[PDB]
Design a protein around this ligand. Structure first.
Ligand SMILES: Nc1ncnc2c1ncn2[C@@H]1O[C@H](COP(=O)(O)OP(=O)(O)OC[C@H]2O[C@@H]([n+]3ccc4c(I)cccc4c3)[C@H](O)[C@@H]2O)[C@@H](O)[C@H]1O
Length: 140
């Protein structure tokens, strides 16, 4: 079962999410990203189970990636759902910052405000190898 779950906003972070997957697999990690490992069945159950199964939760914070979480108090947004699962389960959450603006916590639903308290890694286009090396040091 995967060591690492990658959560991302499809319309803005898909390329970086894919790049992270490639690098982490090259360094020996088993990685869940939906387009490679989400298979048949009711995707709500399968996605939550896949977050639960992975020790590490890598969150791709592209610009505006949490915008659709705002006021989503019924937890219908999928990045919101994945984050709440990771927080509840006490996962090793590793945010990756790629143009993300740090919001005031009160714009987010209470059940995910804690995601902002985890130390995030800045994605450097100029120093990608060093960024990847730092991500690997953060993983368990
Ligand atoms: N039965 C169906 N089969 C195939 N495609 C269906 C569908 N029903 C609806 N769509 C299509 O999917 C789109 C909504 O997905 P997107 O808007 O792009 O997602 P987001 O960027 O918000 O979230 C991305 C984050 O949530 C996770 N994720 C993974 C899989 C998901 C699936 I599968 C459906 C919906 C959300 C998902 C979210 C993923 O692991 C990542 O971390 C709609 O427009 C439909 O065209």
């Amino acid at each position: 079962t995967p060591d690492v779950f990658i959560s991302y906003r499809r319309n803005s972070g898909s390329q970086l999410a894919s790049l992270l997957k490639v690098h982490l697999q090259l360094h020996g990690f088993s990685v869940f990203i939906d387009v490679e490992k989400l298979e048949a069945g009711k995707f709500e159950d399968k996605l939550i189970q896949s977050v639960m199964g992975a020790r590490n939760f890598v969150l791709v914070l592209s610009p505006g990636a949490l915008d659709k979480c705002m006021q989503d108090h019924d937890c219908k947004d999928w990045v919101h759902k994945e984050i709440v699962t990771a927080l509840s389960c006490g996962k090793n959450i590793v945010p990756i910052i790629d143009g993300f603006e740090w919001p005031e916590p009160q714009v987010l639903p209470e059940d995910m405000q804690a995601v902002l308290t985890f130390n995030g890694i800045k994605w450097s286009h100029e120093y990608q190898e060093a960024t990847i090396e730092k991500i690997i040091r953060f993983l368990q």
